Design a protein around this nucleic acid. Structure first.
Ligand code: K
Ligand code: K
Ligand code: K
Ligand code: MG
Ligand code: MG
Length: 136
RNA sequence: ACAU
DNA sequence: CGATGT
C-alpha cells in the first residue's frame, strides 16, 4: 500500500476543540497550498475535516480533475460518504456560522455528483498528512 | 479500541 | 490533561 502522490490532501486546524476552525488543501506531492478557508470562530475538529473534504470535492470538480482526496479523519470520510455530518455541537448564535457551512456542504453533496476517491491517509505508516498545521 |  | 467522533 503506497501513497498516491497525484492527489489532494486536506486537513483541519483549530484553536480549541470546539474552538476556532480553519482548513486547507495542498498538493500531496509538492505541499503547494491550493486553498485555505478563513478561520471560523467556533466549530469542531470533525466539522472542519468534513468541510475540508467537501471543499476539495468542489475544487477538483471545478477544475475537471480526477485526482483523489486524502483525509486523516475516519469520521469526516464517513460523513461525506453518508452525505450527513453527525456532529454533537450545539446550535446557537455562536455556532450558527459553522452549522450554516455544514448544512450547505451537505446540500452540495445532495445536488452534485463526483467520482473522486476519498482515501484514508495512513498516518501510522506515512507520518502526518501533508496539509497538517504543525500544531500538535 | 480506532481515527482525529 | 481536555475535546470530537465511529
Ligand atoms: K496540527
Ligand atoms: K492526525
Ligand atoms: K474518545
Ligand atoms: Mg486531520
Ligand atoms: Mg492535522
Amino acid at each position: 500500500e503506497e501513497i498516491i502522490w497525484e492527489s489532494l490532501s486536506v486537513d483541519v486546524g483549530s484553536q480549541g476543540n470546539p474552538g476556532i476552525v480553519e482548513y486547507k488543501g495542498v498538493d500531496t506531492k509538492t505541499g503547494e497550498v491550493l486553498f485555505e478557508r478563513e478561520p471560523i470562530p467556533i466549530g469542531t475538529n470533525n466539522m472542519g475535516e468534513f468541510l475540508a473534504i467537501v471543499h476539495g470535492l468542489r475544487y477538483l470538480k471545478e477544475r475537471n480533475s480526477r485526482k483523489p482526496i486524502y483525509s486523516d479523519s475516519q469520521t469526516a470520510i464517513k460523513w461525506v460518504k453518508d452525505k450527513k455530518a453527525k456532529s454533537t455541537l450545539v446550535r446557537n448564535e455562536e455556532t450558527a456560522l459553522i452549522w450554516k457551512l455544514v448544512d450547505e456542504a451537505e446540500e452540495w453533496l445532495n445536488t452534485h455528483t463526483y467520482e473522486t476517491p476519498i482515501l484514508k491517509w495512513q498516518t501510522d505508516k506515512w507520518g502526518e498528512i501533508k496539509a497538517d498545521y504543525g500544531r500538535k
